[model samples]
Target: DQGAQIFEAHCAGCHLNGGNIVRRGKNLKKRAMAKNGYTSVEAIANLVTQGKGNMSAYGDKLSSEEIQAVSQYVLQQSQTDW
Candidate 1:
């Protein structure tokens, strides 16, 4: 799972198990994703690329393909309440 590996290396630090360590309310959970308009891969990808509020943009750190892969991984985990 390429996406899983990417997420583990980059995203898991703050978003471990889909929970947001910095901001509890704005987590990767399904409900939070929907509420924050991040329910789709595209939305999540954009968020990761551009960032918002306290989240840091990863555009320079990750390639577009890697970002897309990790975004998909996050969306899948959100659906499963990971």
Candidate 2:
């Protein structure tokens, strides 16, 4: 899937296997996402579009469709425990 491909290229460096190398507590797992209020595609997409703190924004680098696809992919992975 394009989402999985995009994640590998853009997000895997920091979030491989839904794990956050930069911030252990802020990983992409279900519990972490729930704690950070990123349980939905919109929230995840927003973060990708307008990054926070150490995370870089991809709004300029990726299209809306790509962002949405990746966001959904993240959510799905989180649900399945990555």
Candidate 3:
């Protein structure tokens, strides 16, 4: 899956702009330790695998690495733990 495309398609709106993230999710920009705190590569990996909170798990759709990649992409886009 195209990481950026997937991100833009599903994440860009609420995430890249730092507006409506998941319920338990945080405003990535303002949170410096966000990646290490609430969202981890592995945690997001599992979320993509099992889904949680407001996120509808994408296990059935995306591959394991893709999920991790998406998480990484989000982090980088928001420049949190980048």
Candidate 4:
């Protein structure tokens, strides 16, 4: 899927398996999602589109649809162990 490919290329370096190497709090866990206001797929997509702090923005690198798909995929993965 596009989301998986995009994630592997962009996010896997730091966010593999919902784990963040740079900022532990920024991991894609359920608790972290709420803590970071990324509780929904749409919110996660916006965050991915708009980078914050140490995370670089993917808005220019990825299309809007790509961002949405990645965000939804992230949410889906987070529901499990990731």
Query: In model 4, which runs have C-alpha deviations exceeding 4 angstroms?
Result: none
Judging by lDDT, tell me the better candidate of 1 and 3: 1
Per-residue lDDT tens digits for candidate 3, residues 1-82, read 5766777776666666644455434555536336546456665566557866676778888777777788776656555533
Q: C-alpha displacement of 27 in model 1, angstroms?
A: 0.6
lDDT of 1 by residue, 1-82 (tens): 9999999999889998888999989999989988988889999999999988888899999999999999999998898888
Ranking of all predicted structures according to TM-score, beginning with the best and ending with the worst: 2, 1, 4, 3
Question: By TM-score, how accurate is candidate 2?
Answer: 0.97
What lDDT, from 0 to 1, does candidate 3 have? 0.62
Task: Find the 10 residues in a row with the least total lDDT in model 4.
Answer: 30-39
Q: Please, what is the whole-model Cα lDDT of each candidate in the order they appear?
A: 0.92, 0.96, 0.62, 0.86
Winning candidate number (TM-score):
2
Clashing pairs in 2: none
Angstrom error at residue 67, model 4: 0.4
TM-scores for all predictions = 0.94, 0.97, 0.61, 0.90
RMSD of 2: 0.6
Which parts of model 1 are misplaced by more than 4 Å?
A: none
Instruction: Answer with 1 or 2, whichever has the higher TM-score.
Output: 2
- Model 2: per-residue Cα lDDT over 1-82, one tens digit each: 9999999999999999999999999999989998899889999999999999999999999999999999999999997889
Backbone clash pairs in model 1 (N, Cα, C under 3 Å; residues 3+ apart or in different chains), count: 0
Residue 62, candidate 3: Cα error in Å is 1.2
Give the better candidate number (1 or 4) by TM-score: 1
lDDT of 4 by residue, 1-82 (tens): 9999889988999998889999977798778876777768888888889898999898998999999989988988886657
* lDDT comparing candidate 2 with the true structure: 0.96
- Model 2 bad stretches (over 4 Å): none
